[PDB]
Amino acid sequence: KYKLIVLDLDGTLTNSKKEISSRNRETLIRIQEQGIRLVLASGRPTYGIVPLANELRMNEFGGFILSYNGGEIINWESKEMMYENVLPNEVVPVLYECARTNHLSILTYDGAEIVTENSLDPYVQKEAFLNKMAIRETNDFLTDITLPVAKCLIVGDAGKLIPVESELCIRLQGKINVFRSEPYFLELVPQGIDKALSLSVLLENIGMTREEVIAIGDGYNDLSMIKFAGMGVAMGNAQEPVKKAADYITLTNDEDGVAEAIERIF
Numbered sequence: 001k002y003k004l005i006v007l008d009l010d011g012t013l014t015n016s017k018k019e020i021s022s023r024n025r026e027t028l029i030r031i032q033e034q035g036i037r038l039v040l041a042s043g044r045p046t047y048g049i050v051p052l053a054n055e056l057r058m059n060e061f062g063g064f065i066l067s068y069n070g071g072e073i074i075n076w077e078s079k080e081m082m083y084e085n086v087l088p089n090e091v092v093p094v095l096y097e098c099a100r101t102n103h104l105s106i107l108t109y110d111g112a113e114i115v116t117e118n119s120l121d122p123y124v125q126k127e128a129f130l131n132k133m134a135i136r137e138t139n140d141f142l143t144d145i146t147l148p149v150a151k152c153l154i155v156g157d158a159g160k161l162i163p164v165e166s167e168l169c170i171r172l173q174g175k176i177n178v179f180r181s182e183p184y185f186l187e188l189v190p191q192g193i194d195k196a197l198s199l200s201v202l203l204e205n206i207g208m209t210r211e212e213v214i215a216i217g218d219g220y221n222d223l224s225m226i227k228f229a230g231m232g233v234a235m236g237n238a239q240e241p242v243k244k245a246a247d248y249i250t251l252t253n254d255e256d257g258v259a260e261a262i263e264r265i266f
């Protein structure tokens with residue numbers, strides 16, 4: 001009946017120490033060994049997801065990475081990218097100048113590396129540690145990055161980000177969307193980013209229907225895929241509206257909610 005499992009990372013697949021438990025790992029490997037295909041779907045850049053995808057052997061079972069909230073869709077076996085929703089190049093110098101003017105660090109991603117002019121900013125390092133990515137520091141951001149980029153973050157104290165966010169929101173209306181993922185991360189992303197939309201494209205391409213999909217998540221950015229999936233699963237630690245929109249509520253991420261759901265459902 002079900003042929004695909006889509007998982008968010010933080011608050012879902014990973015526990016409170018941001019690790020994949022051995023029970024989750026073994027359950028997901030086994031279910032792939034049974035012919036079920038996995039998708040990791042997360043706001044993280046691709047190389048923040050790659051280590052977890054490698055730990056789950058997804059490169060051996062045709063698993064997909066939906067990085068940047070589905071901004072990119074990559075088959076982690078074949079390495080083929082089927083979908084690339086990136087920032088318009090012309091907005092990048094505007095984002096840079098806004099960060100500079102407001103004395104805040106900007107970062108973006110270039111493969112396995114985070115590129116920034118401020119590697120000593122604790123908020124930049126928070127993103128590097130979260131993704132397990134090395135930081136490449138430059139003194140000429142616009143020269144040293146490789147375009148196009150899927151997103152940028154401006155980072156800093158919440159009180160300093162709110163006005164920058166409020167300015168960019170309208171100044172680049174029509175070119176980008178802006179939101180805060182943590183109080184100190186301002187996400188600068190292309191329009192039309194939604195995990196559910198990217199999932200629908202994936203399903204069209206591999207010839208599956210939404211009824212054949214399980215999607216598991218915890219936060220508001222997982223609501224659309226939980227509704228879209230035939231079997232939407234809310235983690236025990238999920239936000240109340242995610243739980244109410246789900247078809248099934250499992251245990252928390254620290255109680256191996258993902259493994260428990262998969263074993264019960266199958």
Ligand SMILES: [Mg+2]
Pocket residue numbers: 008009010011012217218219
């Ligand atoms: Mg989450």
